[PDB]
Amino acid sequence: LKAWHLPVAPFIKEQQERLMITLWLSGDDLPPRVTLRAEEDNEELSLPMHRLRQAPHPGVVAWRGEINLVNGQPRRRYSFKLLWADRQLWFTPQEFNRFPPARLEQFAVDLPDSGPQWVADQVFYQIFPDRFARSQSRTYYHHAAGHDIVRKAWDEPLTAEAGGSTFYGGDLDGISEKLPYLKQLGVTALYLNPVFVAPSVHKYDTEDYRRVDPQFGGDAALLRLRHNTQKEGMRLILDGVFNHSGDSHAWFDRHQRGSGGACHNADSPWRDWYNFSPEGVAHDWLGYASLPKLDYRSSTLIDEIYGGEDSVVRHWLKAPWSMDGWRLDVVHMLGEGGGARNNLRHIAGITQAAKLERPDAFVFGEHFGDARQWLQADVEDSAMNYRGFTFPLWGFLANTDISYDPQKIDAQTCMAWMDNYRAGLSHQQQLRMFNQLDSHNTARFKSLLGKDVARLPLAVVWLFSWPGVPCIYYGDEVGVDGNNDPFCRKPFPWDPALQDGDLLDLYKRMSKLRKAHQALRYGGCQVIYAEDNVVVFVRVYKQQRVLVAINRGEACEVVIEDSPLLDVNGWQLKEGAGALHDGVLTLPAISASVWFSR
Amino acid sequence: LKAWHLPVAPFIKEQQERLMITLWLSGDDLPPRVTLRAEEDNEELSLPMHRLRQAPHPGVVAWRGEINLVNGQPRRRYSFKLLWADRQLWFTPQEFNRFPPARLEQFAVDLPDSGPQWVADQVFYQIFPDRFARSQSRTYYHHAAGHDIVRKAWDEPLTAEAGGSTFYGGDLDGISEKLPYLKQLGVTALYLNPVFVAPSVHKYDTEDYRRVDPQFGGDAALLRLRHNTQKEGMRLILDGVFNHSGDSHAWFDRHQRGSGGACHNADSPWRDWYNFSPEGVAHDWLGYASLPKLDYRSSTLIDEIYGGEDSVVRHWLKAPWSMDGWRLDVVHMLGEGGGARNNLRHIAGITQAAKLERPDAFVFGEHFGDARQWLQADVEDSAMNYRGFTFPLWGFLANTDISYDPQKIDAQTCMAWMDNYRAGLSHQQQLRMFNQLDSHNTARFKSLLGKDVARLPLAVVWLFSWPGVPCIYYGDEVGVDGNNDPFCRKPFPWDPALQDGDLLDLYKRMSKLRKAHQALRYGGCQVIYAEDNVVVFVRVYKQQRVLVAINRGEACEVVIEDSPLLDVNGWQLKEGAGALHDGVLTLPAISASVWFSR
């Protein structure tokens, strides 16, 4: 028995406050009844389906049912219950199920969708500002480090020494001046690491949430960037560091720059914004003395960060700043009493305050772990998709993982992993998952591949074609490598002699295909083949199809069975050297290929 | 490769604010390292494990690690990461995993446990008061029904006519007078259907939340029951109906008994406690005109139901009532604006208010569906376990399901279903899941079995030995049958000529074994065999073991491989006619057996 359904047209259609749902079946012993099992205000309903008279494709039977949109919550969850006289079988995002699927692992469509619809149209670029570009027209003591900061010329090797204290002097005007490069790359949106006043180079040790650090050009340079990006039709996301402050923040003031710091004054207005021993000594947070954790048990703190009208979260989302969203640093540990108590409520409060100021604000969190409980409760829009995208590819392609432990997973396991994760997410959620290969917090993926660096182009193609929004970590596109923090923060090589121009061109081309084809931005996704070295999946949107074939190993041929999803007029190869003929994929060694239908 | 771990002693031990975690492995190609992957304030940690010098059982290698209890949230989640030079493998509640388990499907132990610890020690009994017992010393118009209520003598057949309007006259003093019967049955706790003033016989159409209905004996009879149960060491749970009110409630007052009813007065104090059209006509709730839904958007309603000190939820939990908890009717749909919007927050508010009045209050909800999102967010203590217990047995034993659709599932599928569901729950949560075979809302299980009614004793034994608290639906124990509502609410047969005394005796014996053996109340649970007709599982607690074998089909023999969990001095058969000798289970047809170790 075979079945097909994706939570997108041609399988679903909205008409006059009804959501029409279509299922495809094929086989010799087809069920004489099918029930659409759909939820309405968390109650399970058994909606009848009826057999369509016309076969949508050869050998396929279509069943159709209807979800009433006038009642119920925006997220429409459903699965299919196949019924014979003596038995039943469920059809789900994870193929067939003999017992009922988890309620939170059904197909799901958000209708009406109140999420940030612009995200699916973006190509993001992540910039660590000190290391990207110095503007054309262009030392103090770091108390938490115990020594003055260090200045380095752009071509000086990056070392393990003075990791959080070494500045190459990149700034926000440098970004503005490189907008033509980024535009040519096909970037439409920027995610910046922290820019607010802070003593370190990474600035996760925030000293002032209301002022841009002068080292990066201060307030005027961020305003210029907001103007220049808007002018070029680009989105701009700031790093929101609300789990903790820096220990030079005036609220805390460990090195006693002034008065009323919480660290040394029991009567400080911010004393209950932090955690102290019974004797009144400030607790460190996880060995990090420089990053004291904020205590969201305090109502006055909640008001400062997100609760009030001029809270921090809302401040940078209104004029004159008008930023497009927040990436939430340490989204999973923020909470009360020194740990994650009530974490979900505080993340939801942040997101709600952001959307109050700016309805289409994009709020997404740094989740190295499993983000599904956060996303299934709608406390944020999206997550940095380490568990659903990054680590599956680190395993399948680079034989390693979050802990840099060895991994040996084949194609079957990789795609079971990736499909299981997104089964927990609505289609609209899947399309805005923040996908990337590495970050300021990981070793460079090019490094992790080691002897198999020839696989790097496969990951780039995958980055732009899996459901979700792709994010390029600055320098990835010209071949920058290096180990984990501090060595993943190399200065960008603007000398073309030091750039991998062939890799740059592949990024450019992939962004071109994504902008050109609706299925790469809105489409459903069906894995058609996954065995050993080869993954084949199709993106599906209305009548259009995008086929992707990835082969991590030696040259091979793969027979692709007849699928009603592949029943098109014909295929046009757009990228890669693969070839498709009469159901046979001829795949060169270490290759990825992309076809468009018709 | 083989592995063993249960989230209970002998596998875990608390010592000086550390939780020691032990894993058992066996095989020819054992991993040279194992990492305890444990979460602390939602951050994933890689805690090293070390090989113990002594083999706990023959051919078994033990690895040990430590979770620090001084930091982190009460729920301690963990899994095991087996490591070879080139590869890894995860060990989870659902056996081995090739890619990381879901964060919410790991092993989990609540330490410190602030849940209701008395629940695991209980045997519950559910009473529908009109139909249980009439007290020794012993008609109006039902507006929502359109006709006067009906009186029936105890021996008159139950019919489909006047379903919610027919009274056999059972009352709360009748319950008091049958406490000796219930005590002999081994009942320690009562769950009552609604008792507050209401026109119908089931009383889910609440008219006054502050008064016991006089038909059941009014306030004085409930007080006598609270006294008599307390005297006999029994717990008492009331039905909390907070999703909706009755349409004769004074807040709503459809039939205009007085003034200021919301239904007909736009200026009523309760107008925004319900949903009206733009023209001011009261919306029905799901076809039910008699059950208008409460709008928790209203702050004044929140205060009435749970927010204030003398809210309804807290009112019956303090003196003089001092009830032990609430069963929450329609827990999944309660919310704002006419649907389930913000359902999770309002259920959490109810539970919090209950525990504020009474720290060990037990609050659990009626979940016909998948309750895991509710339980994984701790918004209630437990759920009526239809998805994790009831419907798996309806499938495996009675070939049917929630929708009375045909089911054909074998033992493998049944136990995959039951084990997958509880993998989402901590051990402490698993032990208080509210397990039963049928209710006032389902057909009687004895009926559902049809031609296979000889399987009924298997379900009873299972009811008392699966993790969770068992609940007997009144009359189940003497063989009462019948179809779904109204026919599942038969008057209890106190004539012994009409009772199945052999079935009654089995219930009595099973409650005796549960009270006698710690593993049936606190123990972990490991499925040892599940194939076709036969399920074999072991409850495990410290050095004690309870083995259970269930055979739904013909007589057979099953070979039970050597397990370090079964390595005991010997086994004593306590119930059933099964026999265990040199690893061979001889199982009679349609049988369940229970052994105690040593």
Ligand SMILES: C[C@H]1O[C@H](O[C@H]2[C@H](O)[C@@H](O)[C@@H](O[C@@H]3[C@H](O)[C@@H](O)[C@H](O)O[C@@H]3CO)O[C@@H]2CO)[C@H](O)[C@@H](O)[C@H]1N[C@H]1C=C(CO)[C@@H](O)[C@H](O)[C@H]1O
């Ligand atoms: C002192 C450090 O501050 C920064 O790191 C913070 C920051 O809030 C965030 O990057 C956080 O990162 C991750 C996740 O929260 C975790 O889920 C995941 O398991 O681990 C990630 C990285 O740990 O980590 C810090 C808060 O926990 C800054 O980015 C760092 O560079 C740190 N600065 C120092 C630190 C060292 C040695 O620890 C130096 O080598 C480094 O070069 C400096 O920049």
Ligand SMILES: C[C@H]1O[C@H](O[C@H]2[C@H](O)[C@@H](O)[C@@H](O[C@@H]3[C@H](O)[C@@H](O)[C@H](O)O[C@@H]3CO)O[C@@H]2CO)[C@H](O)[C@@H](O)[C@H]1N[C@H]1C=C(CO)[C@@H](O)[C@H](O)[C@H]1O
């Ligand atoms: C009018 C009815 O009131 C009661 O039923 C309510 C009640 O709040 C609760 O029992 C609820 O039950 C279940 C769950 O909430 C659902 O998750 C699940 O899918 O379905 C369950 C049962 O529907 O159902 C009602 C609120 O939805 C009372 O128990 C019932 O007996 C009803 N009273 C009438 C109804 C009919 C025909 O509908 C008569 O045959 C019956 O004998 C009467 O008592």
